[PDB]
From a paper:
Staphylococcus epidermidis, a commensal of humans, secretes Esp protease to prevent Staphylococcus aureus biofilm formation and colonization. We show here that Esp cleaves autolysin (Atl)-derived murein hydrolases and prevents staphylococcal release of DNA, which serves as extracellular matrix in biofilms. The three-dimensional structure of Esp was revealed by x-ray crystallography and shown to be highly similar to that of S. aureus V8 (SspA).
Purified Esp was crystallized, and its three-dimensional structure was determined using x-ray crystallography. Esp displays a β-barrel fold assembled from two discrete domains and a C-terminal α-helix, similar to eukaryotic serine proteases of the chymotrypsin family. Even though Esp exhibits a highly conserved, compact β-barrel fold, the five or more intradomain disulfide bonds that are responsible for the structural rigidity of eukaryotic serine proteases are absent. Each of the two Esp domains is comprised of six antiparallel β-strands, and the solvent-accessible catalytic and substrate binding sites are situated at the interface of the two domains. The conformation of Ser235-Asn234-Gly233-Gly232-Val231 peptide segment in Esp is rigid with conserved backbone angles, supporting the presence of a functional oxyanion hole. The N-terminal segment of Esp and V8 crosses over loop 1 into the bottom of the S1 pocket, and the N-terminal Val67 (V8 Val69) amino group is suitably positioned to act as an acceptor of the negative charge of P1 residue side chain.
Residue numbers in the entry: 67 to 282
The structure:
């Protein structure tokens, strides 16, 4: 959903700082492909949307994850294939994807630093945030950072005023400490963008499936 606030900047030094965990997702469908985004949060784990993993039609092996992808011809951290899809049991567009190790028996959370999850104890409306991931209007597997403000927090719903584009499905929403406060899932044209807010209940689901999860 493209809004009056469309402040987007490409990221090139993708393997450094907090960008490293921001991941590009590619799923073939016989006619073409679908793409999306996610964020590495544990040794073998990314967070993304239910609607993203549902594109695999029940086979996790159809999902390729490229952490820190720079463009279609530059995956500096290679890829990791889907192994197990663990949907968040609650009523939000959130899933964990566990991935296999790569061809060098490296784990995804060893090649990049797993992202820091916010406890969201301090998160409030009007807060300045970024949503960073792989928009579909841009060239395949290019990373973009969008700047915006939180407008709504309720239940598992966090809405902001910044712009995103199909492919931004699954993009982490960062606070100023570069901690993940939520996971983008879509938007309502001319009104706001929407994300899964990482509330206490979501945090419990993360802890119960990702033993090493870093929540601060």
């Amino acid at each position: 959903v493209i809004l009056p606030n469309n402040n987007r900047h490409q990221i090139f030094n993708t393997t450094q700082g907090h960008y490293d965990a921001v991941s590009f997702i590619y799923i073939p469908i016989d006619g073409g492909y679908m793409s999306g985004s996610g964020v590495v949060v544990g040794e073998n784990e990314i967070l993304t949307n239910k609607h993203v993993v549902n594109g695999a039609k029940g086979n996790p092996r159809n999902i390729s994850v490229h952490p820190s992808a720079k463009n279609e011809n530059d995956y500096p951290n290679g890829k990791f294939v889907g192994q197990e899809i663990i949907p968040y049991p609650g009523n939000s567009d959130l899933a964990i994807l566990r991935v296999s190790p790569n061809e060098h028996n490296q784990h995804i959370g060893q090649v990049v630093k797993p992202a820091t999850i916010s406890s969201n104890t301090d998160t409030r409306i009007n807060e300045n945030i970024t949503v960073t991931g792989y928009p579909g209007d841009k060239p395949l597997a290019t990373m973009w950072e969008s700047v915006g403000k939180v407008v709504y927090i309720g239940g598992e719903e966090l809405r902001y005023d910044l712009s995103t584009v199909g492919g931004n499905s699954g993009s982490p929403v960062f606070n100023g400490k570069n901690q993940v406060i939520g996971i983008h899932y879509g938007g309502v044209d001319n009104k706001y963008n929407s994300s899964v807010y990482i509330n206490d209940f979501v945090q419990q689901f993360l802890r119960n499936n990702i033993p090493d999860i870093n929540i601060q």
